[PDB]
Amino acid sequence: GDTRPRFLWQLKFECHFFNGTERVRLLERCIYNQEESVRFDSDVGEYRAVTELGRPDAEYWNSQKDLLEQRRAAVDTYCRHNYGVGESFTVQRRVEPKVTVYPSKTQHHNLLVCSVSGFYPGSIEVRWFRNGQEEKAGVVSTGLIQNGDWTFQTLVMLETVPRSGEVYTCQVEHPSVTSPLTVEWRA
Amino acid sequence: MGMFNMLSTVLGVSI
Amino acid sequence: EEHVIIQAEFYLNPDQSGEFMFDFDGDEIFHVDMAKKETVWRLEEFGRFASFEAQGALANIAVDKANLEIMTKRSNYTPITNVPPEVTVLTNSPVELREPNVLICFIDKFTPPVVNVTWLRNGKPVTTGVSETVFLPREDHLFRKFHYLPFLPSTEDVYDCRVEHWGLDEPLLKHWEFD
């Protein structure tokens, strides 16, 4: 039923940037059937085998003085270069989130949901206040969700039986607004 | 416009 | 670290297909389409700030296929062992009646990168304006993929994401319906 065996080879060149381009590190990785076999780590400057399968390639590639010179240099020619190219629309991308509050039930209301949609980048702080007192216990969340199209979303819920006369406020802080967003949900 | 660079895969050892 | 940029390629036999894409912090920047031999940007505004020479990517894949036959042999022809995906269906944003939305079917933590995905509206397969990402990388060397179905949310309709993969017994149906 298409039961034929599969053989899979994957390559990853990862550039890791710490504090801008101040410190950059390269990992070239060769992966056979989901096991990494050889790797080039800019911090070593030679290939090392990771499994027995990789030993031939590491020895062989380490003989090509040309290849090695090229990769050692790659942290300039490839990583820092590309960072430059894309910086303007990847690193500095900001997309403000949309915030909605709305009541709910649990698998008469018992749940206040605070939805935060369509923001970038991923890091956000969402908090619940009753009048002015932050509510910490009884908050549950979906955690940060990535949509795959350069936005994120999250739901942050608060288990409460809302008493009338109280104001619940969901407050969001995010690198795209220079002042926190709020949404009230009264009585 | 900047041009993105790529790294070239190099051939392994055969027998 | 602040950020990571991954150039990620693969080649898979016997299906004889390989992708080449760039990832920034887990989002796709662009892939190269082996079929139409050109570069495809994940968002239009990217292709008007930067560009990439697609040709060289084919060069890499040809090499990758070469290497794949070398490894298949060197490993004494031992094949990949299937890892079945996990799937959740999600909307783009909280749904309001008669405003456009998108159903997201998120397929995660599986290998090899071959998965058949079909959308179902009230049980009939539907395909109008659907779209997909390429297979995206993970640090464990499994894959992720997103499938998209734009829709006008109504009381009437129920939707399903059906995912078939070699690692699963029967296929996975993941349900969604307006509340």
Author numbering:
A (entry chain BBB): 1 to 107, 111 to 190
B (entry chain CCC): 2 to 16
C (entry chain AAA): 3 to 181
Sentences copied from the publication:
CD4+ T cell responses to IAV, mediated through recognition of short peptides presented by HLA class II molecules on the surface of antigen-presenting cells, are essential to multiple anti-viral processes that confer protection from severe symptomatic disease during IAV infection (Wilkinson et al., 2012). We focused on the HLA class II molecule HLA-DR1 due to its high prevalence in the human population and the pre-existing molecular studies using this HLA type (Cole et al., 2012). Unbiased epitope mapping of the entire M1, NP, and PB-1 proteins revealed five IAV epitopes that elicited robust and reproducible responses across multiple HLA-DR1+ subjects. As part of our structural investigations, we solved pHLA crystal structures of three conserved IAV epitopes used for clonotypic analysis (HLA-DR1-SGP, HLA-DR1-QAR, and HLA-DR1-GMF; HLA-DR1-PKY from the F11 complex included for comparison).
Fine mapping of the T cell responses using shorter 13/14-mer synthetic peptides based on in silico binding prediction (Andreatta et al., 2015) was used to isolate five HLA-DR1-restricted epitopes for further analysis in four HLA-DR1+ donors: M117-30-SGP, M1129-142-GLI, M1208-222-QAR, NP302-314-DPF, and PB-1410-422-GMF. The most conserved epitope was PB-1410-422-GMF, with complete sequence conservation in 41,104 of 41,222 sequences (99.7%) from strains in humans, birds, and swine. Indeed, V-gene biases were seen in response to several epitopes shared across all donors. This was most striking for PB-1410-422-GMF for which more than 60% of TCRs utilized a single TRAV gene (TRAV2, mean gene usage frequency = 62%; number of donors, n = 3) and predominantly recombined with one of four TRAJ genes (chord diagram; TRAJ16, TRAJ17, TRAJ3, and TRAJ30). Similar to our observed patterns in humans, responses to M117-30-SGP (mean, 22.0 SFC/1M splenocytes; positive response cutoff, 20 spot forming colonies (SFC)/1M; and double background) and PB-1410-422-GMF (mean, 38.7 SFC) peptides were weakest, whereas M1129-142-GLI (mean, 211.3 SFC) and HA306-318-PKY peptides (mean, 298.7 SFC) had similar frequencies.
